[PDB]
Each structure stands twice: as structure tokens, then as C-alpha cells.
Structure 1
């Protein structure tokens, strides 16, 4: 390019690069979450596994965006990746709350990009986001909301017991 670029605005190109940064930031956040749950003084393997899988999914999301950027003739531009918001993530409940906040933020960014593409008359972009991002995000947020509810029901007056049981009976493979 510019030998292939067609109907692909500079605005959308810039927003795609920003979304890549957001997805890589989310991947980094999930990497931190996963290793926190691997600490010997935390030790919840099912929760390490849940977050490590999400780190992989977010990195895959970034790569799909980057591939799309190149398919349209746009140019990938990478920025610094800011460190995650916390160094320690508290309880499973605290972590799951932070994760849903994070996913809602990604979802809103996807919706904003879809709106931009619709405004720019870019149906390929709209289709691409629909096909590989919007429903995945909705399904993920539903799963996290389900988890949050189960974690909340388990707090009772025996929070340690509840945290163990949720990891053993819901999260662990």
C-alpha cells in the first residue's frame, strides 16, 4: 500500500491501532492476575488457569486486529504498554470484579469502533467486529457475571471456605 487500500479511513486505522494497544494491555493484566494466583501464599490453581487462558485470548484478539489492519492496507503502529493497574489482586472476588471492569472497557471500545466504522461507511470493519469480537465479548462477560454471582453466594461467614470451594468445583479442570 497504498496499492490495496480501499474504503479504509485514517480514523479507523488509528482506532484499530488503539484497540490493539488495549487488547495487549488486557493480555498483560491477565498475565499479572494469573501469576498472582500462582503465589505460594495465594495458591488457587483454577483461578491462575482461568486468567492465563484469558491472557492468551486477549493476545489472540490483538493479533486478529493486526492481521486485519494489514489486510486493509493500514499500518500497524505500536505504543508503550502500560503496566497493569495493580501489583496484588486481592481475593478471587476482587480479581473477578477487576476482570469484568476490564472486559466492559474492551467491549465499549469495540462498540465505539463499530460506531466509527458505521459513520465511515465501512461494512468490512463492521462485519469483522461482529464476526470475531462482539459476541465473544458478550459471552465472556456473561461467564464472568455468572462467576461473580457464585463467588458472592459463597462468601457467607466462611470466606476462605467459599474461595476454596469455588476454585475446586467451578474453576479447576
Structure 2
């Protein structure tokens, strides 16, 4: 029951649903990261804000994919959202490392989807991901920049460096 579907493979439709799940899972992970840094015994507001902003971005990405699914005449199918991989996230450095791992996995899923689109001769999908692809590269570059600065600040005054990074790099 679609009267509009054209050149939209069942393979891409399913891959888009899986990507929505991955984006929502990422959003959930960032929600957990954000609130961890808001704990009174962690108390790094710039870090909390950074991850809460990412939770919003990932949710927005999922919503864009869902809009596209309907635009193409595919059917959204939702699965459980697995809880994030940790309950406590360690240091800012630990968290930023986890975030980059997460983003690399999202990026790989985008790359896999683009490849499927190319194999299926689906240029609209290709065009649509173009939005996701650059945004992801920009985000990963930012995270790498952050990680380098966090790492430079460890030294052997780790608490001091963690405070200074949150105060002087992150938005608060």
C-alpha cells in the first residue's frame, strides 16, 4: 500500500530502518553520557552540554531518515532500543573515546548504506545521504580535535586538565 514507491529497493528500505535504530541508539547513549556529567560527583557542565547537544542531533538524524522513508514510500519499522553500553562513563577522555567509537560506527553504517544505494542504482538515496555524510565527517574531526586536547592536558595533573578543558574549550 504505497502509490508512490519508485526505484526504492526492499534492501534499502530495511537498511534505512536499521539506520534509524542506530541513530536512536546513539541518541540514547548521548542522553546517558550527558546526565552522567551532570552528576554532583562528576559536575562537568560543558561536557554534559556537549553530549546533550549530540543526543538532540542524533534524534534529529533519525527523524530525517524516517521522513525520507515515507517520502520514498517505504514503511518505518521500529525495534527495541538497546540501553547504552555503560552506566558510568569514566573521565572526559573515556567518554570522548566512547563517542568517537560510536560515531565511527554510525559513519560506517552510512557508508554501507551509500554503497547499497549505489549497487541498487538509487541516486536519490545517494543524494539524500550527502546531510549525513559531511555532518559526520565534521563531527568526527571535532571529536578528534577534542581528544587531542584532552590528551595533552592529562600530564600528571589530570583533575586540573579535565577542569580546564571543560572550562576553556567546551561551551558553558
TM-score tier, shorter chain, comes to: over 0.9
* TM-score normalised by the chain length of structure 1: 0.99
Match of 1:83, SS? coil
How much has 1:2 moved relative to structure 2?
Answer: 2.1
Paired with 1:36 and 1:133, the residues of 2 have a C-alpha distance of: 27
CA deviations on 1:107-166 (whole Å, 9 max, x unpaired) are: 000000000000000000000001x10000000000000000000000001000000000
SS where residue 62 of structure 1 aligns? helix
Measured against aligned partners, the alpha-carbon deviations of 1:82-122 in whole angstroms (never above 9, x if no partner) come to 00000000000000000000000000000000000000000
Distance in structure 2 (CA, Å) of the matches to 1:92 and 1:3: 50
5+ residue gaps, structure 1, are none
Task: Find the aligned partners of 1:161 and 1:150 in 2 and give their Cα distance.
Answer: 13
Q: Secondary structure at the match of 2:8?
A: coil
Partner of 1:6: 6
Structure 2 regions of 5+ residues with no counterpart? Answer: none
Q: Quote how far apart the aligned CAs of 1:17 are.
A: 0.1
Q: Secondary structure at the match of 1:171?
A: coil
Is 1:115 aligned to 2:104, yes or no? no
Q: Which of structure 1's runs of 4+ aligned residues deviate more than 6 A?
A: none
Cα offset, 1:172, TM superposition = 2.6
Deviation at 1:48, TM superposition (A): 0.3
The RMSD of aligned alpha carbons is 0.5
Q: How many residues align?
A: 172
Q: TM-score, normalised by structure 2?
A: 0.99
Q: Deviations over 1:41-76 (max 9, x none)?
A: 000000000000000000000000000000000000
Tell me how far apart the structure 1 counterparts of residues 153 and 171 of structure 2 sit (CA, whole Å).
Answer: 16
Q: Deviations over 1:14-33 (max 9, x none)?
A: 00000000000000000000
